[PDB]
Curated annotation (Swiss-Prot):
Lineage: Eukaryota, Metazoa, Chordata, Craniata, Vertebrata
Protein name: Major allergen Can f 1
Protein's organism: Canis lupus familiaris
UniProt key word Secreted: yes
Localization: Secreted
GO cellular component: extracellular space
Shown chain mapped onto the complete sequence: 31 to 174 of 174
Similarity field: Belongs to the calycin superfamily. Lipocalin family.
Keywords: Allergen, Disulfide bond, Glycoprotein, Secreted, Signal, Transport
Major localization listed first in the record, in broad terms: secreted
Length: 118
């Protein structure tokens, strides 16, 4: 669960850069949001982690599913960028199976974020 990862879907972002999980666990995405850039860097510490976040394996080759409470959403991380309909279908069930049913948004993959006119 280390290295380049791709946040593929989620139950706001207009595009998203790759994810970098360093091992407490430490993630860095940068997120394109209405012509801005949100550079995130969230340490996850082991208590299910900490917001509160449960990482769980996906049933599918090369994918993981995140549940986090703190509003509650769900995310589908992948190890290679391409769309996996069968990874989605499972992320949907999981998402309804945990109380979340507000549009599986499948994310746009940019290699950089440049702010509007910045
Ligand atoms: Ca938008």
């Amino acid at each position: 669960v280390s290295g380049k990862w791709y946040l593929k879907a989620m139950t706001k972002p207009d595009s998203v850069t790759p994810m970098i999980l360093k091992a407490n666990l430490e993630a860095k995405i940068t997120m394109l949001t209405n012509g801005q850039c949100q550079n995130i860097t969230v340490v996850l510490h082991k208590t299910k982690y900490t917001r509160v976040v449960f990482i769980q394996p996906s049933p599918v080759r090369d994918h993981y599913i995140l549940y986090c409470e703190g509003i509650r959403m769900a995310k589908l991380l992948g190890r290679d960028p391409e769309q996996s309909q069968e990874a989605l279908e499972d992320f949907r069930e999981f998402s309804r199976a945990k109380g979340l049913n507000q549009e599986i948004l499948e994310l746009a993959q940019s290699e950089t974020c440049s702010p509007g006119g910045q």
